């Protein structure tokens, strides 16, 4: 097991069944977070106070408390260009689609 | 294994070695999140778009992608009353000390 970090996650829309509508992008890099959250907690993981406390207690008695989790701390959107039912050409922005950074929470 | 949710986490400061200074609180309920993040994703877990996508892919091929994680989505602070080195009586607020809600991220 490794230290919490951002790994790759290639997303393919051609598998969504949106083929009669979507124009671009047809795939994108979404990324994902995976890894161990434990001392020492490197600054980039930006732990919260609660995270620091929970990691301490889990460090003292793993049975009592589980470790914190490596999750996306900041995400960005992506816009999708498609042709809707009415045949209009829409450019829609979707929030929280790309992982910008991982941290322990 | 159960569904992502807020469990209890009783924190005891008398174990911090802050005894010559801290007055109150000496213990508090910090809570913690624990549980499975998988379909169906109940509304209270407030998943992000990225979470919905990652859960889908993990649902289609668990080897490729790991599930999302049950973590604190909103936290509140607590204030601590202590007597510092100079013998001043300080009332300090600490951010992100109590888990208000858990979600899948």
Tell me if chain A has a CB within 8 Å of the CB of B75. yes
Task: List Cβ<8 Å contacts ≥24 apart for A93-98.
Answer: A94/B49, A95/B48, A95/B49, A96/B48, A96/B49, A96/B50, A97/A28, A97/A30, A97/B49, A97/B50, A97/B53, A98/A28, A98/A29, A98/A30, A98/A31, A98/B50
Q: How many CB atoms lie within 10 A of CB A56?
A: 14
Angle at A13 between CA A12 and CA A14, to 5 degrees: 95
Measured at the alpha carbon of residue B9, what is the angle toward residues B8 and B14, in degrees to the nearest 5? 145
Count of structural domains within chain A: 1
Q: Could you please report the per-residue DSSP string of B89-105?
A: EEEEEEEEEEEEEEEE-
Structural contact between residues B105 and A71, judged by C-beta atoms closer than 8 angstroms = yes
A70: its two tokens: 């490596």
The resolution in angstroms reads 2.4
Helix (H) or strand (E) holding A60: helix A49-60
Contacts of B50 (CB under 8 A, 6+ apart): A30, A72, A75, A96, A97, A98, A99
Could you give the CA distance from residue A4 to residue B83 in angstroms, rounded to a whole number?
38
**Residue A58 phi, psi (nearest 5):** -70, -30
CB contact under 8 A, B50 and A105: no
The structure's method of determination equals X-ray
Between the CA of residue B36 and those of A57, A96, B69, B71, what are the distances in Å?
Answer: 21, 21, 8, 11
Question: Do residue B32 and residue A54 have CB atoms under 8 angstroms apart?
Answer: yes
Number of Cβ within a 10 Å radius of residue B15: 12
Q: How far apart are CA B81 and CA B57, in angstroms?
A: 48
Residue B53 and residue A75: Cα distance in Å, rounded? 13
* Residue A8 structural domain: 1-105
**Contact present, B35 and B105 (Cβ < 8 Å):** no
A105 close to B (CB below 8 A): yes
Residue with tokens 């795939």: A27
What count of other Cβ atoms lies within 10 Å of the Cβ of residue A28?
Answer: 16
| CATH number for A94 | 2.10.90.10
As a whole number of angstroms, the distance between CA A28 and CA A78 comes to: 9
For B25-89, the three-class secondary structure string (H helix, E strand, C coil) is CCEEECCEEECECCCCCCHHHCCCHHHHHHHHHHHHCCCCCCCCCEEEEEEEEEEEEEECCCCCE
């Amino acid at each position: 097991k490794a230290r919490c970090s951002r790994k790759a996650l290639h997303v393919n829309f051609k598998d969504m069944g949106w083929d009669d509508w979507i124009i671009a992008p047809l795939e994108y890099e979404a990324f994902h977070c995976e890894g161990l959250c434990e001392f020492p907690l490197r600054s980039h993981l930006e732990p919260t106070n609660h995270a620091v406390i929970q990691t301490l207690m889990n460090s003292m008695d793993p049975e009592s408390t589980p470790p914190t989790c490596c999750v996306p701390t900041r995400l960005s959107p992506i816009s999708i260009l498609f042709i809707d039912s009415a045949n209009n050409v829409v450019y829609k922005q979707y929030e929280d689609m790309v992982v910008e950074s991982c941290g322990c929470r």
